[PDB]
Ligand binder design. Structure first.
Ligand SMILES: CCC(C)(C)[C@H](N)C(=O)O
Ligand SMILES: [Cl-]
Ligand code: NA
Ligand code: NA
Length: 245
């Protein structure tokens, strides 16, 4: 009876919409927590007197402890300050104090370049950190003291941390990165690189953010929706058995 099928469709749409929104929130809260942390660290570095910032030895001794404590507070992988001479003061997970490194090619990096092109925090796509060889998301920020550039702050957070948060959420939810490659999922099988996601991705392009759609898998009907969340695409799908059976 159409009345009953409509009531089941409306219910499951609501439920699945809610669950999609939980995954969206997870991504938003991960980002904003890292941004706030990065902003706080900027403020504490820029608060230092100029004298503490204008020789490399003073940067080591005065900025280094701040990087280390901040790193520990959030269990970041790397926290660092890159200078215009190409050196970077690096606090890395491993208890030796932070050291100035001249070998990390920092002006070639997008976290460095892009921080100098915006007054905001820059957020990288996930990429393989050169130092610890883990996949990270980097938050970077050009630090200025009274208009004068001190250097570019960077904070590397393992991308696994966001993957793990997403996976824990309820519902059959998943994320794609900017390249429409699968990035995270509640059901770990979706992460197989050989899975074709065109049906979902195509139905999302046709329907738009948060607009619920029908599609087929192995001749069976499924329901889903996606929405953009920053550069990511977040999706949920389920079997259409709830409305058909
Ligand atoms: C100093 C910059 C490092 C920490 C090496 C950054 N993850 C990068 O890979 O560029
Ligand atoms: Cl993020
Ligand atoms: Na780069
Ligand atoms: Na989920």
């Amino acid at each position: 009876d159409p009345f009953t099928k409509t009531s089941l469709y409306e219910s499951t749409l609501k439920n699945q919409t809610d669950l999609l929104k939980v995954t969206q929130s997870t991504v938003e809260d991960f980002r904003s927590t890292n941004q706030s942390f990065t902003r706080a660290l900027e403020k504490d570095i820029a608060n230092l007197p100029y004298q503490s910032l204008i020789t490399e030895e003073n940067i080591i001794n005065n900025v280094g402890p701040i990087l280390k404590y901040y790193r520990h507070s959030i269990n970041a992988l790397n926290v660092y300050l890159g200078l215009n001479n190409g050196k970077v003061l690096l606090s890395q997970k491993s208890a030796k104090m932070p050291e100035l490194r001249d070998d990390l090619d920092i002006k070639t990096k997008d976290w460095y370049q892009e921080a100098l092109k915006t007054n905001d925090i820059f957020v990288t796509p996930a990429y393989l950190d050169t130092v610890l060889k883990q996949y990270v998301i980097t938050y970077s920020k050009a630090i200025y003291k009274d208009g004068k550039i001190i250097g570019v702050l960077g904070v590397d957070i393992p991308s696994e941390d966001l993957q793990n948060l997403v996976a824990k959420t309820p519902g059959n939810t998943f994320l794609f990165d900017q390249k429409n490659k699968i990035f995270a999922a509640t059901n770990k099988e979706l992460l197989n690189p050989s899975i074709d996601h065109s049906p979902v991705l195509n139905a999302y392009k046709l329907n738009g953010d948060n607009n619920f759609f029908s599609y087929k898998l192995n001749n069976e009907e499924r329901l889903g929706a996606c929405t953009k969340v920053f550069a990511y695409t977040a999706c949920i799908t389920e079997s259409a058995d709830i409305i058909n059976k």
